[PDB]
Design a binder for this molecule. Structure first.
Ligand code: 147
Ligand code: 147
Ligand code: MG
Ligand code: MG
Ligand code: MG
Ligand code: MG
Ligand code: MG
Ligand code: MG
Ligand code: NA
Ligand code: NA
Ligand code: NA
Ligand code: NA
Ligand code: NA
Ligand code: NA
Ligand code: NA
Lengths: 1011, 204, 204
């Protein structure tokens, strides 16, 4: 045997790891990166049968196809084809913890393929098969004979089939185990799936071949000169006539070249490597690589006889860059980086863990368009094309070993155990051997959430010895252990310390200066974008810009891991943990992305775009100061557009070319402006626009923006006198006010506005009443469960306090006739089990112009948990197509997540006012609004609001968006005040004190009128 | 102050006065103050104040009311922070309790006179037969702000007739990280744009 | 214990302290202080003076002390507070969170200053929170930071007692005088009164 229950056996007959090969036989095709006739794909239609345990597989399958097998596409994860269920568990392992054993019932995928091999491949050289990703462990047979075995789901397994194959038809048999001892090191927080989920290929190499090659680029002090050093190793027939020529190209121009015979310098008393050769090429004024300008060269490595026969050629894209930590700072090409990063899992809602070029490209475009410059491979080596794309489009990468043992207790139980050193070593070393020549990889990581064990210290040192060009990081065991060159915490807050024993999460600003500490700090995970979140994001960015050693971080995370399911009617819907019968499970914790699984953005993405801008601005008088945060390029594809508007109405605008050097400034003086007609606030908005398309953005792409309030002329102009006075009519149960075509009815038993008529049409489906709660966000719930309440979560604190069930008690309701209006005065108390939680006192003044001015003053008991909101709500009878407001927008914005929003006049379709979070909650709020228009109504004031076809009650009771149903009418929530949403993490309260409603007394006012 | 509105209405059990004023300079409106005074059968006068402050004017030193009371009394008694002078950014040492001091203890004799003697977090203030209730900051003494500002040495101050009372809904921090560059932290500047406060003046 | 050397009014501030011809006079002010006070246990830190920029004479005297008395650290604020003549980062009036990036001698936020690239020393402000008049606004912000950051080890408030002097009026009664009140000019008026206590020891 049971090799899959033995961590001492992680492979049998597997070839050594090495950088990407294609064995070209023509150097120009190697130079151009064209396809090679010696590298074939075996992707396509294969045969597959599912078995409940390896003991159930029939021997016959080795020799021939099973009649009951299906033909399926490979690569794939078998759960995506319905064979068995994917499981969504976060920390707790999906199997009983009893290493190194796995369950007797262990889903086994039997894959097979009959394929052709040309005779020419068998007349010479070696033919190997490569499986880029097999989850979790597998045995391979060729033509009925056993070839070998492999573990590690995330790196390639290569086997020499030379002696097993025959001309023409051949048949592969692959028996894939879902669970193996490798599973104890694969406990990442993601769907647990299995299968042959990365490409399968066949590669022909000559008998005398390039078996490995390492490319290094070293520089002089100002990066005006470099030496490219390429060490090449061969296997096979070593003879004096062999040579290696390494040539370096910048496009179609050859910039350098060197040729040498094999035989490295003397290494020790026994000599040197007669099978290795190191070529050193001098390159003057090299064009440097960065995420800003991903300049690349092409190195071609030719193995050939001295007299001119090319044996084979391999090759790679080279990016000239130096990565080093000096004086506490991580520098790239001598300048300190500011990492605008994101963690990105390999996830597709239809294909599972199978990646494709299109999806990868789509992700890199969106990342770049949203001002990200870096990505962490949470938490494993990625599909090979990912690196190629990050080298070409330009993203800094953290390459991470596939080692995560989160569910152990304590977390380092395996990583501190020498018996697991061998299995861990292969996960680290084979990754470095495969990905060490990609310029996009700038930092190596030892894996994730596996505590800190002595195995990490050994491996940290192994990487530092083999590759001195990149720092090594690892967060386990407290984020600043001896196994990391970078303090790289997860979810450490900006100012707040969380002093957990043994592994405290200090405020990042305090962490940098602890006694004796000198390393740079880059969070490996920060701001958990689960549901309506990212509150407090701007606090991180202000700190990063202020403190040199705070060099950024990687947002958690890029894309929700939701999967598509289909209902009885055949309509697709987004599913999360437990939706496949999987249990135990961790429900919606698999959805923490800035974008939905189909790549549609969540609102939080625009907040990240704005805080991660590369241009900063300051305003002084008529002067705008632009500062560039690029380190290497000048602003050669950018112009500044500016607009001054009065409450939404444009008054003046222009454009100015931007010419700012990296880290430089440009002062721009705006024109003499037209002093405004009417009253209101003037606002200046500026945007940086890229006129020319790029490889990653369209012409006109906006990359940065900022707004400022300019002059304000408060209105002192009196409204005209009205030719009318509203009339009051009273009964024991109501106060009715009439003014022309308008009527208002106040219920004297409840003390609320129960109905309004315009003309003779009823406007309300439910009365206008105070609201102190919200349908809880993922951050309000945290890890709380019905089955296991977490009393410290906001939602539980509100529930326990009775907020959700408190009943309004009427303390007063009066009506008075004024000179030109009717005034209704009310007071209510909300209580629970004898405790008065809130007191609401209001006045409603309806004048002869038909406007109703509502004044609200609320008292909140200092000892009840601060409430989610202080506002009013009602179900309007009308359903209108559009929503138009003067306030922050156009996207959803909350108090602690509104920096990206701009004050202007926005107008959207109603549905755009609802955000379809998979797990429904309060959503769609827009803050800082001065006027709201819907149908015939207009509300004016200074408030926050949401408007949609779904009640807060319905959102709190429904757990999946596809189950919500539009209600009659439109539910309007208009808040004087609304609590922050939080998001530094999604398992402990994270709303900062300044965003909690703790003032005790609150005042707000609204005018509701028609038009 | 330029008057925008002054009306009176009678309600079932009270009289309501409504006023609106604008404060201007060189044709710019700096602040707009809207108030209601509601006088009831109990003799209590409830004052509601809603102020607007133009966004482009420097944030103001305070948002309150003031008057010169005709009489002088021996003690000042309040339910709020104290007993000593305290300001928004310098009130951590003060305690919420019922305090009672002689009127002169309500004036701090800084050699170079200025605004002084405020107490914050006050829910009730008693002076002679008067009582003010709300959630405000106040100072009370024999010297007008005008006098303090015009006088550079404490020995030249003279007690005015009566008692000057400044009652603030909001008051700016005093700063002090240095005394040569603005040092009041943003969180203590009156930059909210719209401010509301309410007070009840009654007799005791 | 601080040597009597302050040349604040020079332009630039280190004009004399960077001049070897002034090394002898400066040296006597440091050496004679150490010879006098080195046996007192209350003295825990020596200081090279105040507001005299940073000149090579400071570096020479810093080493002299280190050599003769290894038992006490040496500090000195001039020249940017973190020069080679100080074992403690000891700025004056650096704020808690806000940087003041003056050219050549910036005053960083203290929290940020601790972590600048390559910095490892403790930080104790030689002067902070200027208690001139109605002041000390934001004092709590410093103490919250000192308790949260191990390397922020406190500071010396500026300052203990107002430097006012007594003058007598026509009637013979005393009053508190400041700059210019003796016919002295030029003068810096009330900037001599920055204490937590009045000159007569009554507290502010
Ligand atoms: O509340 N807990 O006990 C708890 C324990 C472990 C947690 O792990 C956290 O889960 C996150 C869920 O999206 C991510 O997987 C993150 O990597 C991890 O640290 C989060 C919460
Ligand atoms: O504003 N200035 O130009 C200015 C120049 C020098 C200043 O020096 C400051 O004065 C303080 C006044 O009590 C103290 O003497 C302090 O030691 C000194 O740094 C303060 C302000
Ligand atoms: Mg094994
Ligand atoms: Mg050639
Ligand atoms: Mg042949
Ligand atoms: Mg984990
Ligand atoms: Mg569960
Ligand atoms: Mg003078
Ligand atoms: Na930084
Ligand atoms: Na998760
Ligand atoms: Na430009
Ligand atoms: Na819900
Ligand atoms: Na004065
Ligand atoms: Na400390
Ligand atoms: Na002074």
């Amino acid at each position: 045997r049971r090799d899959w229950e033995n961590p001492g056996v992680t492979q049998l007959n597997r070839l050594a790891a090495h950088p990407p090969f294609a064995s070209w036989r023509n150097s120009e095709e190697a130079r151009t990166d064209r396809p090679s006739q010696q590298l074939r794909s075996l992707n396509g239609e294969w045969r597959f049968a599912w078995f409940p345990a390896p003991e159930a597989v029939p021997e016959s399958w080795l020799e021939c196809d099973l009649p009951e097998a299906d033909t399926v596409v490979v690569p794939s994860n078998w759960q995506m084809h319905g064979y068995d269920a994917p499981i969504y568990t976060n920390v707790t392992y999906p199997i009983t913890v009893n290493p190194p054993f796995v369950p007797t019932e262990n889903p086994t995928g039997c894959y097979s393929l009959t394929f052709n091999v040309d005779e020419s491949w068998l007349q010479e050289g070696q033919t190997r098969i490569i499986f880029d990703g097999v989850n979790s462990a597998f045995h391979l047979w060729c033509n009925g004979r056993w070839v070998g075995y492999g573990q590690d789901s995330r790196l390639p397994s290569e086997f020499d089939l030379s002696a097993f194959l025959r001309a023409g038809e051949n048949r592969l048999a692959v028996m894939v185990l879902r669970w193996s001892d490798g599973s104890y090191l694969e406990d990442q927080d993601m769907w647990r799936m299995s299968g042959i989920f990365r490409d399968v290929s066949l590669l022909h190499k000559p008998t005398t071949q390039i078996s490995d090659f390492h490319v290094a680029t070293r520089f002089n002090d100002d990066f005006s000169r470099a030496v490219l050093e390429a060490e090449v190793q061969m296997c096979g027939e070593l003879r004096d006539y062999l040579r290696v020529t390494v040539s370096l190209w910048q496009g179609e121009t050859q910039v350098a070249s060197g040729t040498a015979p094999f035989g490295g310098e003397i290494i020790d008393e026994r000599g040197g490597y007669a099978d290795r050769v190191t070529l050193r090429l001098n390159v003057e004024n090299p064009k440097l690589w960065s995420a800003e300008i991903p300049n690349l060269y092409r190195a071609v490595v030719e193995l050939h006889t001295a007299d001119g026969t090319l044996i084979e050629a391999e090759a790679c894209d080279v990016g000239f860059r130096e990565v080093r930590i000096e004086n506490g700072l991580l520098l790239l090409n001598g300048k300190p980086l500011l990492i605008r990063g994101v963690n990105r899992h390999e996830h597709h809602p239809l294909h599972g863990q199978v990646m494709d070029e299109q999806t990868m490209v789509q992700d890199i475009l969106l990342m770049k368009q949203n001002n990200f410059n870096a990505v962490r491979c949470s938490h494993y080596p990625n599909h090979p094309l990912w690196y190629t794309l990050c080298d070409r489009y330009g993203l800094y990468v953290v390459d991470e070993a596939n080692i995560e043992t989160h569910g152990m207790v304590p977390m380092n139980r395996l990583t501190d155990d020498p018996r697991w050193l061998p299995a861990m070593s292969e996960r680290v070393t084979r990754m470095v051997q495969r990905d060490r020549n990609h310029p996009s990889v700038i930092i190596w990581s030892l894996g994730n959430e596996s505590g800190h064990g002595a195995n990490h210290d050994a491996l940290y040192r192994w990487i530092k010895s083999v590759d001195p060009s990149r720092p090594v990081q690892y967060e386990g065991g407290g984020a600043d252990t001896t196994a990391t060159d970078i303090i790289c915490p997860m979810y450490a807050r900006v100012d707040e310390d969380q002093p957990f024993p043994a592994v405290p999460k200090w405020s990042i600003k305090k962490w940098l200066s602890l006694p004796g500490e000198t390393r740079p700090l880059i969070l490996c995970q920060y701001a958990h974008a689960m549901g309506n979140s990212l509150g407090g994001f701007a606090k991180y960015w202000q700190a990063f810009r202020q403190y040199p050693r705070l060099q950024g971080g990687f947002v958690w995370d890029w894309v929700d891991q939701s999967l598509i399911k289909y209902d009885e009617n055949g309509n697709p819907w987004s599913a999360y943990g437990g939706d496949f019968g999987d249990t135990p499970n961790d429900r919606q914790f698999c959805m923490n992305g800035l974008v939905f699984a189909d790549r549609t953005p969540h609102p939080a993405l625009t907040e990240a775009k704005h805080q991660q801008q590369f241009f900063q601005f300051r305003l002084s008088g008529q002067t705008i100061e632009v500062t560039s945060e690029y380190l290497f390029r000048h602003s050669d594809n950018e112009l500044l557009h500016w607009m001054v508007a009065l409450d939404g109405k444009p008054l003046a605008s222009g454009e100015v070319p931007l010419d700012v050097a990296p880290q430089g400034k440009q002062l721009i003086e705006l024109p003499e402006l037209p002093q405004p007609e009417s009253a209101g606030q003037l606002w200046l908005t500026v945007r940086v626009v890229q006129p020319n398309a790029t490889a990653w953005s369209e012409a006109g792409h906006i990359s940065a923006w900022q707004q400022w309030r300019l002059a304000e002329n408060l209105s002192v102009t009196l409204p005209a006198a009205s030719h009318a006075i509203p009339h009051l009519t009273t009964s024991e149960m109501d106060f009715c006010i009439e003014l022309g075509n308008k009527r208002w009815q106040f219920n004297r038993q409840s003390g609320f506005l129960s109905q309004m008529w315009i003309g003779d049409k009823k406007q309300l489906l439910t009365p206008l009443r105070d609201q102190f709660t919200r349908a809880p966000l993922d951050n309000d719930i945290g890890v709380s469960e019905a089955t296991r309440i977490d009393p410290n979560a906001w939602v539980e604190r509100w529930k326990a306090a009775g907020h959700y069930q408190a009943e309004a008690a009427l303390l007063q309701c009066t009506a008075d006739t004024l000179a030109d209006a009717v005034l209704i005065t009310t007071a209510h108390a909300w209580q629970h089990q004898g405790k008065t939680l809130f007191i609401s006192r209001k006045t409603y003044r309806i004048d002869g112009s038909g406007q109703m001015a509502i004044t609200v003053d609320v008292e909140v008991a200092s000892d009840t948990p601060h409430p989610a909101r202080i506002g009013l709500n009602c179900q309007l009878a009308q359903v209108a197509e559009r929503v138009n407001w003067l306030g922050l927008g156009p996207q959803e914005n909350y108090p602690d997540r509104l920096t990206a929003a701009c004050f202007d006049r926005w107008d959207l379709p109603l549905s755009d006012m609802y955000t379809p979070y998979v797990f429904p909650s309060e959503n769609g709020l827009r803050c800082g609004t001065r006027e709201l228009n819907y149908g015939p109504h207009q509300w004016r004031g200074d408030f926050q609001f949401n408007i949609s076809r779904y009640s807060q009650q319905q959102l709190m009771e429904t757990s999946h968006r596809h189950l919500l149903h539009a209600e009659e009418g439109t539910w309007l929530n208009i808040d004087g005040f609304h609590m922050g949403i939080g998001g530094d993490d999604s398992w402990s309260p994270s709303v900062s004190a300044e965003f909690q409603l703790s003032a005790g007394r609150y005042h707000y006012q609204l005018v509701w009128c028609q038009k």
